[PDB]
Design an enzyme around this catalytic site. Structure first.
Site, PDB file in Angstrom:
ATOM      1  N   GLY A   1       0.852  -1.196   0.000  1.00 34.67           N
ATOM      2  CA  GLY A   1       0.000   0.000   0.000  1.00 34.67           C
ATOM      3  C   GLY A   1       0.882   1.238   0.000  1.00 34.67           C
ATOM      4  O   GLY A   1       1.704   1.411   0.940  1.00 34.67           O
ATOM      5  N   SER A   2       0.758   2.031  -1.049  1.00 39.85           N
ATOM      6  CA  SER A   2       1.543   3.266  -1.282  1.00 39.85           C
ATOM      7  C   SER A   2       0.602   4.483  -1.286  1.00 39.85           C
ATOM      8  O   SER A   2       0.819   5.395  -2.092  1.00 39.85           O
ATOM      9  CB  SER A   2       2.367   3.158  -2.563  1.00 39.85           C
TER      10      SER A   2
ATOM     11  N   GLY B   1       1.284   4.743   3.830  1.00 44.70           N
ATOM     12  CA  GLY B   1       2.466   3.992   3.376  1.00 44.70           C
ATOM     13  C   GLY B   1       3.587   4.911   2.955  1.00 44.70           C
ATOM     14  O   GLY B   1       4.752   4.627   3.283  1.00 44.70           O
TER      15      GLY B   1
ATOM     16  N   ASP C   1       2.004  -1.189  -4.661  1.00 45.74           N
ATOM     17  CA  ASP C   1       0.562  -0.854  -4.753  1.00 45.74           C
ATOM     18  C   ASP C   1      -0.033  -1.580  -5.952  1.00 45.74           C
ATOM     19  O   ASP C   1       0.762  -1.912  -6.911  1.00 45.74           O
ATOM     20  CB  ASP C   1       0.339   0.646  -4.839  1.00 45.74           C
TER      21      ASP C   1
ATOM     22  N   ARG D   1     -12.439   4.605   5.667  1.00 44.24           N
ATOM     23  CA  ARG D   1     -13.784   5.128   6.009  1.00 44.24           C
ATOM     24  C   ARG D   1     -13.816   6.644   5.711  1.00 44.24           C
ATOM     25  O   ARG D   1     -12.812   7.354   5.989  1.00 44.24           O
ATOM     26  CB  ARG D   1     -14.107   4.740   7.466  1.00 44.24           C
TER      27      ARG D   1
ATOM     28  N   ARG E   1     -15.536   2.354  11.326  1.00 41.18           N
ATOM     29  CA  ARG E   1     -14.389   1.514  10.877  1.00 41.18           C
ATOM     30  C   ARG E   1     -14.939   0.166  10.377  1.00 41.18           C
ATOM     31  O   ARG E   1     -14.419  -0.314   9.355  1.00 41.18           O
ATOM     32  CB  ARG E   1     -13.348   1.361  11.993  1.00 41.18           C
TER      33      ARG E   1
ATOM     34  N   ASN F   1     -12.129  -5.233   2.195  1.00 40.88           N
ATOM     35  CA  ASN F   1     -10.819  -5.214   2.891  1.00 40.88           C
ATOM     36  C   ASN F   1     -10.407  -6.620   3.303  1.00 40.88           C
ATOM     37  O   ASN F   1      -9.178  -6.889   3.263  1.00 40.88           O
ATOM     38  CB  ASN F   1     -10.828  -4.260   4.072  1.00 40.88           C
TER      39      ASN F   1
ATOM     40  N   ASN G   1      -8.305  -1.071   8.017  1.00 37.55           N
ATOM     41  CA  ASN G   1      -9.481  -1.086   8.912  1.00 37.55           C
ATOM     42  C   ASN G   1     -10.497  -2.102   8.409  1.00 37.55           C
ATOM     43  O   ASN G   1     -10.573  -2.416   7.230  1.00 37.55           O
ATOM     44  CB  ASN G   1     -10.028   0.305   9.247  1.00 37.55           C
TER      45      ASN G   1
ATOM     46  N   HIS H   1     -10.328   0.512  18.409  1.00 40.98           N
ATOM     47  CA  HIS H   1     -10.750   1.930  18.258  1.00 40.98           C
ATOM     48  C   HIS H   1     -12.191   2.161  18.758  1.00 40.98           C
ATOM     49  O   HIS H   1     -12.912   1.242  18.834  1.00 40.98           O
ATOM     50  CB  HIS H   1     -10.557   2.354  16.794  1.00 40.98           C
TER      51      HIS H   1
END
Ligand code: NAD
Ligand code: JUT
Ligand code: JUT
Ligand code: JUT
Ligand code: JUT
Ligand code: NA
Lengths: 312, 311, 311, 312
Positions: B7-8, B12, B31, B80, B86, B93, B118, B173
């Site tokens: 993940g960029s 990231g 990515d 989100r 979340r 995901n 998340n 969270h």
């Protein structure tokens, strides 16, 4: 920002070095001995060039060069050699501290002053008496060293980083020292929870307190010279807290003004440092904790009074 | 040292930036989107040159380029937006984390893995299930971020630096979060002594706990984007603890088996990180502290089960 | 010390981040868009707590909060869209920079001002014209980015660190750019000695100059966003030179006052920055080097005149 | 990563300090004198806790603790005081370097070795002869220190930062030193352009070259001790280039094999440092530049042969 080191010995040079690494200010390296600060200034200029630091550095034997300094670090004094009583050391370093106090008043009366000369509890009180500087603008570096040693030894025993081990230690070095287990925590968790889980014993904590009291003498016995790197790091942290108005929390010699049943004396205590200086705060001690602190305070009071007499 | 960013996006890239500044390792920026990691790698190379950093940075769309990474940071996911919990995000995901888990098992099964997608505690459990990496080599960043908010707010109220304000926050969270006033200290001094001195009230502490729970949603509401700088810093601290064998102490999502009455689940808990991974420790909780924790753990258990079914 | 970011987009936020890491000052994050600077200020406060930085951060939509700032960084402006001509961009960013110039004069007339808005060579001139600030207290960030890219690429080809590769590049980005191979060196050794030793060819140097001209557009094409990390690093270096009175050397847009056959214009040139501002210096150019520079200067003069008319 | 300091005097301790600040590795502080490295290790541990650094530090009198070290820094020697040349000692420092060379071969033959002991170019040749380490795994710090002084002084005169002032200086300290004005630049701009613009004169540059040659002796004369901070910084830069595979560019004592007409000898020259060691490179010198270098090289050749005899 102008940082004036009064004393260009081992501690003063390393404080200079750490102020450059850390980009806190221009340096004035002052000493009475011809050439010492000039030589050390040359070395620190070459160091700066290799490490990409761009601050001005002056080495000087002329006290007027401390003019308008924002920060004063006082390491000026001598080591007690063979033929010298503790009373002879107090007389020589106290006379030096009186002279520095007068020069700071004359040349840079708005400086924040960090006293380091031994014996520390005494020499901070000598500086205050003869400087006519505000008590908030004076402190002595001591408690951070004792705290750092105690926290690093607790961290070693629990097999954790020292980064989040925090403790309150009141009073001075050695027998003057009053550590508070109740105000010792490991990333917020009181020390007592580690005792409860048998990750450390009360005997191990007592042993760590004894090593803490004795650490200065242990380094002197092994290195045949007093600690220099850690004192310098502690001084540099106090400088940074003043200059960047950080309100970082320290045990340092600070003026008590009713706190802990004490007024009108510098003693090792809980303080915060911001751009108005070093300010005590009082926490609730038990009766036994306060009796031990009052005993530490009475010793500082007694030794400071003796020192003023030894200075005529 | 090889640090692989799966993940960029915003987090990231900033993790990459902070790893370059701290000199922790060579970077792989991965990515799924063609060009994004290549472009950000160019930017971070020019940034490196200006700041005097010498580490290699590769941007790639080939996930096998993570081969023999020491460190994996996973931000692959959707975030989100305002109006969203979340917990809504579990379906898309989940599938993403499963596919990443399969690639990490193939290409760098000895990596230390920090999951950031998340919902955080669920996606750590998904990563473990489909990677079969050792339990201690997998964690999630959450507790450091929550702790930084709570400690910042306590420090502001007491008019002190945050540098020596420390706290234990257990669970996930938002409603999942269990902050412990009894394990909050200001340079060693318990929070309760500040209450006793009337420097802060129990009502002010409750209000700070509420701001802490709601902080992620508040940043999304104001900035129209989720937090990036503080998450990145939290991840970089965990990376540094593993690489330099530091035994630094954190709340992070970690595998509990018996700890705090929890069996066989990754959840926010007290741990230390060293070069063998993340190691949980159990502290003595009150009955009310443990009831609140058990409630947070039950919600993560329930949502993890839901996630495995959706996947 | 107070650092005011006029613009809280990608570059402004990263400049804020790097100012906090370097401990250069308190931040003011200003933007016209409600909530954006407030959200990013929250994120940067949490980031500060995790990394042990203790500076104040204010996010605000009220321009008067820049009062008595020591430093102003201007990224206020829009991005160029496909329909939007170069002329439309000049008109929108020009009007914004005029308004910012007026606010700086009113609220923080003693600030050192670093202009970053597109087109960079025009917008620095626009700020000067409407600010009534001294020319020494204004500069524009560009040359450092081009220099970092050119030096990185030369370092890559010679298989050396970039830390001691230095070069003078005059003028602006792209066609405005005038690189001087004669003032390029590797730890003191002129570039031409590497050509003599066949470690790099003149064709390789020309290819590196073309990649440097095109780098901005290449990052835009890959990342679908303009460079942010490297621009922020360049800006933070210039801030540090002013605040710490460093007399560090840069090519940045600086007011020429007889230098290089030019007065009364900001153009990318050889300058040093200290606590009195940004000061040009002239070096002996060959006739061909000076003709190329004069052509770059005539283009900036021409475009700046066009911009004043559009505004 | 394991960094072994062979010598726990002023330079070794400050190299330790800078390696801890830069987080480069765990330290082994070794010295022959009982207690000195133990005391300094305690000091550097307390320093680490105050600054938030987490590395292990061992002080030891047992040479086998250097086992499998990645990095060796040798400061073991006696130093020159004022009234002494660098070349004066050299039987005692040569025997010390021989013994260290034998220990490194026995305990850590894969180490990158940075020699610092005092007749610098000679003691690097002594280390090679008795260690039989690969040529590229051995170097000496000198040229970065001379370069830092020369660049600092040029920067002072031009009123610019030293960050972007760069120069090639070939050979050893003092009369051994060959600075190249042609390979001196200020952010890419040759020094000669500053002469042309009358910002600095040829006489000012000659005076700067003389101050550079004499700087070691000047610091000894003023500070009553040899330079320590800048040598330590120069060593730490070389360590970092090896550990992080940086291909940073330096003048250091390096094995030449045909470069600059030099056969089979370690001498101050242009090199890059990466994780395979120190790799020399040759640039085109004029006849006058090469005659001066060949003269410096012939003196090192002559003195190295003499040193091997003094060691028998
Ligand atoms: N506070 C602490 O916890 C702590 C820890 C260790 C050491 N210390 C103390 O710090 C002090 C300095 O230690 P050091 O290792 O740097 O000592 P040092 O002897 O290396 O340096 C002291 C310097 O002060 C100079 N000096 C002497 N008289 C002076 C005068 N009249 N005016 C100005 N300068 C003068 C000396 O020339 C010398 O250069 C000592 O008193 C030592 O006991 C305190
Ligand atoms: N003014 C205030 N100081 C503290 C504090 C200060 C010093 C300490 F050493 C401490 F542990 C707490 C907390 S609030
Ligand atoms: N193994 C051990 N863990 C700790 C510890 C871990 C996490 C925490 F959040 C903490 F406060 C202490 C102390 S010893
Ligand atoms: N204002 C002054 N600049 C120099 C110098 C400046 C900028 C450069 F880019 C440079 F390469 C030399 C020397 S004095
Ligand atoms: N392999 C290579 N070495 C250099 C170089 C090395 C050392 C120097 F001191 C230098 F000025 C250039 C340039 S390319
Ligand atoms: Na690993």
């Amino acid at each position: 920002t102008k940082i004036a080191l009064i004393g260009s010995g081992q501690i003063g040079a390393i404080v200079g070095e750490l102020c450059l690494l850390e980009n806190l200010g221009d340096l004035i390296l002052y000493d009475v001995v011809p050439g010492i600060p000039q030589g050390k200034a040359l070395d620190l200029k070459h160091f700066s060039t290799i490490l990409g630091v761009n601050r001005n550095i002056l080495g000087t034997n002329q006290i007027e060069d401390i003019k308008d300094a924002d920060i004063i670090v006082i390491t000026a004094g001598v080591q007690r050699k063979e033929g010298m009583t503790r009373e002879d050391l107090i007389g020589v370093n106290g006379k030096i501290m009186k002279s520095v106090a007068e020069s700071v008043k004359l040349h840079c009366s708005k400086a924040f002053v960090i006293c380091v000369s031994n014996p520390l509890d005494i020499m901070v009180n000598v500086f205050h008496k003869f400087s006519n500087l505000p008590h908030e603008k004076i402190c002595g570096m001591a408690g951070i060293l004792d705290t750092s040693r105690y926290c690093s030894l607790i961290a070693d025993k629990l097999k954790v980083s020292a980064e989040d081990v925090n403790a309150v230690i009141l009073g001075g070095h050695g027998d003057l020292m009053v550590p508070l287990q109740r105000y010792t925590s490991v990333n917020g968790v009181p020390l007592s929870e580690f005792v409860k889980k048998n990750m450390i014993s009360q005997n191990e904590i007592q042993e760590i307190i004894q090593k803490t009291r004795n650490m200065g003498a242990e380094i002197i016995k092994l290195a045949k010279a007093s600690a220099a790197f850690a004192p310098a790091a502690a001084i540099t942290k106090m400088i940074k807290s003043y200059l960047y108005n950080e309100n970082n929390l320290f045990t340092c010699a600070v003026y008590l003004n009713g706190h802990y049943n004490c007024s009108n004396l510098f003693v090792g205590s809980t303080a915060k440092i911001n751009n108005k200086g070093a300010h005590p705060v009082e926490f609730p001690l038990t009766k036994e904790e306060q009796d031990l602190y009052t005993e530490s305070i009475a010793s500082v009071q007694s030794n400071t009074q003796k020192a003023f007499d030894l200075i005529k």
